[PDB]
């Protein structure tokens, strides 16, 4: 008799496959066994992994019913673990805390349909940005997206994803807008980036979020964009002096705007 449309042999192979994948996901998101509640909740399937077996041994156990062989329940549990692992990996440089991880797990497990969750949609958007930036080459669009996604990962690690933080929603929307905007709309890209750095409550959002080299490169990018159409070499030298700033800041942007208005008057 077919189970779920698969021949029983395929079903009982998929059971052991899911068990092994759950073990792999646990080993990936917690190699040190810190997440004790998760370990306990998934113990019935991680036993076959902690203790060493053979594929055919686990398949025979599943056939006999010793293993949890309800493929639907196993798929749900594996999806919970996979979503948690995706959240951890998308912010891999900015790892979060154990209590936050466990609360996120609890919200997941409580969720009726985790695949369709707004949590899942947010994780998809974050993975979209990260995938775009993985192999991205230098350009103002990519640099602004990288800085914005680093701060987004910081906020995600801080406040999880189950909590629909207004700042996180704004970061998601602005990052997706910048991603979708054409590469030739440089003025619009700069407009969105400067609007974000203005509207962030923190005066200097990228103080510790980004490395110093990239912070200086962002400052240089802003100064270079301000450079064209400068009525005075003195104003160009003032821009160079502002270039000494270690990182971008609201006051730095306001100084750029002041110089811009000076050049508006002079031109």
């Amino acid at each position: 008799i077919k189970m779920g449309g698969l021949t029983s042999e395929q079903y009982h192979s998929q059971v052991v496959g899911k068990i092994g994948y759950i073990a792999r996901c646990m080993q990936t998101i917690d190699p040190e066994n810190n997440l004790k509640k998760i370990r306990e909740d998934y113990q019935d399937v991680l036993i076959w992994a902690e203790k060493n077996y053979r594929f055919e041994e686990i398949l025979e156990a599943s056939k006999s019913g010793k293993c949890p062989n309800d493929l639907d329940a196993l798929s749900r549990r594996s999806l919970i673990l996979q979503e948690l692992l995706r959240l951890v990996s998308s912010i891999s440089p900015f790892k979060m805390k154990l209590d936050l991880i466990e609360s996120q797990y609890e919200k997941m497990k409580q969720h009726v349909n985790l695949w369709k969750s707004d949590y899942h949609v947010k994780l998809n958007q974050l993975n979209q940005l990260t995938d775009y930036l993985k192999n991205a080459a230098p350009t103002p669009k990519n640099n602004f997206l990288r800085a914005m996604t680093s701060v987004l990962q910081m906020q995600i690690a801080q406040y999880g994803i189950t909590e629909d933080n207004e700042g996180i929603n704004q970061l998601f929307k602005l990052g997706l807008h910048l991603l979708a905007m054409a590469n030739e709309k440089i003025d619009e890209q700069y407009h969105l980036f400067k609007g974000y750095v203005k509207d962030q409550p923190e005066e200097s959002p990228f103080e510790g979020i980004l490395p110093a080299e990239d912070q200086k490169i962002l400052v240089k990018t802003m100064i270079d964009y301000a450079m064209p159409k400068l009525s005075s070499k003195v104003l160009q030298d003032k821009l160079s002096a502002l270039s000494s700033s270690d990182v971008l800041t609201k006051t730095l942007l306001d100084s750029i705007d002041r110089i811009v208005k000076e050049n508006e008057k002079l031109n």
């Binding site: 779920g4 449309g5 698969l6 395929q10 192979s13 998929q14 052991v16 496959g17 899911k18 068990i19 092994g20 994948y21 792999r24 996901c25 080993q27 990936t28 053979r54 594929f55 055919e56 686990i58 493929l71 639907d72 798929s75 594996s78 999806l79 996979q82 695949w115 775009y132 669009k141 991603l179 979708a180 905007m181 054409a182 590469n183 709309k185």
Partner: protein, 600 residues
């Protein structure tokens, strides 16, 4: 090991000394090794439908007996590849032969074994880890758009005894190697899968997300869904003209598989020329559609066996990319030509036909093809949800609705965008006949609409009611006369004209109407139905009152409003952003309300 040819009759060879040959098994007939498929056994003699011209095949010719059925090489190299009906790569044949002809019995690999692919294994995998069919054990950077997730073949399983490190590998290099029951199976990045077998999935989930074509009529009145199943007429002006290329350029789909089952020569040439030049905006860049589309071409003069296998090859590629975790929009240029091929092969086999000469299993074959569609929780441990959305084209003889293939299709497909010959003659494009065309996915899409476009369902209901009332009133108007019509009837007729001419009429060649976003569609329908309801309210309220209002009064007062509603279709999403279009439609609604307040 190998048999001998006993007789030949067109594509139907008959090979003797084939005692153990299996049904639908592959054989190579002749000294040129023409591909053939065993379709019948009689003792030690096998009838073979041959996939190439059989002229010059002589009795006694060797018939190699390959152990596998008709199967496709699924792996890196599919995307952007133009394929014959049986996976033969036309472009590779051209490059290899340096001639414009398809040599008979050509045996070039479907997937090139010389292109180095950037392979990165799934990091969490290790020697000894358990894997099963569907397990994505690595990813090939096929191109900027599609990440080819190398899946363990279905019906494979075991312990990973060796996983290749990240690097560059051929399509023939051994990339994974896994043991099961002591037997070691070595897997490269290409897996051979029979085209006539459904690729297994964990679970076929219900379709609950729209597949947005570019047309307002199809998107609103008769929605399609991801994992859907659609029948669409092959009438000229519509179909290949706009809809196919619009699905290609933009839609919810992540991959496109376009199978030209029985395409005419120059029209297939048109497809092969246009598609490699179409571009779409992805992540702020313009990228060729070929980076995510594959074509299975089969002209009408190619062998009928290949014409029959074209649909299966296309659907198998679509199923592979569905198992990848993608949404694959498949477009069959003509299932009618597929049915013609089936009828001809049935005649050559001397089977008893059903009505109109088609085989009595035409419906079964059509179902086996269509029902391979759907949204599925793909096999494999890494959770993913793919889909295959089939759009099969039916072109009956002289627009026949009782055509056997059309009836079999209507018995299977859930969406049907019927053809209005009258609209086609008047040049009303799309030529969809909204009275017999249907979509059964409206119920499943209620959840999607009631969360994203909450107000669209009542608009659709009212629009359909208005169109049906116009259909009922036009008969009376042209039978008897227009003088006896009530004011409400006049509102219905003129609003129906407005909707038909400027909401259901979409020219797909203009920069502004090439693809109509669903926000544009819903906003337009909302404005039109709001005008309908408010005009009817005014007319009915002023009825039985001294200051009676009539359709003539309304039109004379606000011809400007009618013109603006008519020009609403001209909004261009590319430059008139979503916010701008929504604001303009809100302004039109405000003007409508103000003008009707002044009237009242």
């Amino acid at each position: 090991t190998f048999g001998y040819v006993h007789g030949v009759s067109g594509p139907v060879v008959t090979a003797c000394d084939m005692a153990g040959a299996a049904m639908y098994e592959l054989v190579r007939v002749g000294h040129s090794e023409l591909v053939g498929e065993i379709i019948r056994l009689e003792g030690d003699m096998a009838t073979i439908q041959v996939y190439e011209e059989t002229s010059g095949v002589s009795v006694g010719d060797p018939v190699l007996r390959t152990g596998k059925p008709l199967s496709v090489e699924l792996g890196p190299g599919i995307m952007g590849a133009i394929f014959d009906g049986i996976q033969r790569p036309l472009s590779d044949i051209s490059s290899q032969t340096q001639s414009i002809y398809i040599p008979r019995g050509v045996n070039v690999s479907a997937l090139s074994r010389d292109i180095k692919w950037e392979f990165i294994p799934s990091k969490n995998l290790r020697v000894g880890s358990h894997i099963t069919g569907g397990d994505i054990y690595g990813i090939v950077n096929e191109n900027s758009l599609i990440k080819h997730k190398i899946m363990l073949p279905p019906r494979s399983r075991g312990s990973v005894t060796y996983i290749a490190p990240p690097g560059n590998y051929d399509a023939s290099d051994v990339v994974l190697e896994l043991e099961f029951e002591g037997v070691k199976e070595k897997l490269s990045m290409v897996q051979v899968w029979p085209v006539r077998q459904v690729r297994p999935v964990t679970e076929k989930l219900p379709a609950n997300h729209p597949l947005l074509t570019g047309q307002r009529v199809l998107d609103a009145l008769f929605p399609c869904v991801q994992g859907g199943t659609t029948a669409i007429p092959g009438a000229f002006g519509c179909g290949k003209t706009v809809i196919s290329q619009s699905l290609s350029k933009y839609s919810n789909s992540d991959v496109i598989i376009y199978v030209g089952c029985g395409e005419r020569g120059n029209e297939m040439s048109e497809v092969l020329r246009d598609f490699p030049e179409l571009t779409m905006e992805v992540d702020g860049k313009v990228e060729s559609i070929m980076k995510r589309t594959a074509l299975v071409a089969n002209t009408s003069n190619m062998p009928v066996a290949a014409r029959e296998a074209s649909i299966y090859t296309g659907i198998t590629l679509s199923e592979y990319f569905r198992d990848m975790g993608y949404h694959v929009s498949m477009m069959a240029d003509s299932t009618s030509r597929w049915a013609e091929a089936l009828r001809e092969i049935s005649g050559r086999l001397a089977e008893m036909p059903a009505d109109s000469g088609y085989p009595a299993y035409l419906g079964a074959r059509l179902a086996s093809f269509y029902e391979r569609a759907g949204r599925v929780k793909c096999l494999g441990n890494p959770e993913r949800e793919g889909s295959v959305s089939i759009v099969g084209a039916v072109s009956p003889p002289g627009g026949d609705f009782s055509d056997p293939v059309t009836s079999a299709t209507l018995g299977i497909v859930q969406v049907f965008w019927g053809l209005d010959k009258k609209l086609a003659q008047r040049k009303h494009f799309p030529s969809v006949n909204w009275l017999i065309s249907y979509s059964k996915y409206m119920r499943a899409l209620d959840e999607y609409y009631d969360k994203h476009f909450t107000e669209f369902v009542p608009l659709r209901t009212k629009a359909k009611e208005i169109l049906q009332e116009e259909e009922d009133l036009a008969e009376i108007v042209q039978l008897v006369g227009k003088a006896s019509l009530a004011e409400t009837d006049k509102i219905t007729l003129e609003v129906a004209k407005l909707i038909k001419d400027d909401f259901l009429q979409q020219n797909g060649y203009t920069p502004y109407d090439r693809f109509c976003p669903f926000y544009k569609t819903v906003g337009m329908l909302s404005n039109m139905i709001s005008f309908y309801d408010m005009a009817r309210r005014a007319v009915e309220t002023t009825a039985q009152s001294d200051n009676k209002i009539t359709w003539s009064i309304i039109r004379e007062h606000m011809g400007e409003i009618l013109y603006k509603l008519s020009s609403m279709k001209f909004k261009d999403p590319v430059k008139d952003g979503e916010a701008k279009i929504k604001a303009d439609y809100a302004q039109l609604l405000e003007d409508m309300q103000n003008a009707f307040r002044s009237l009242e």
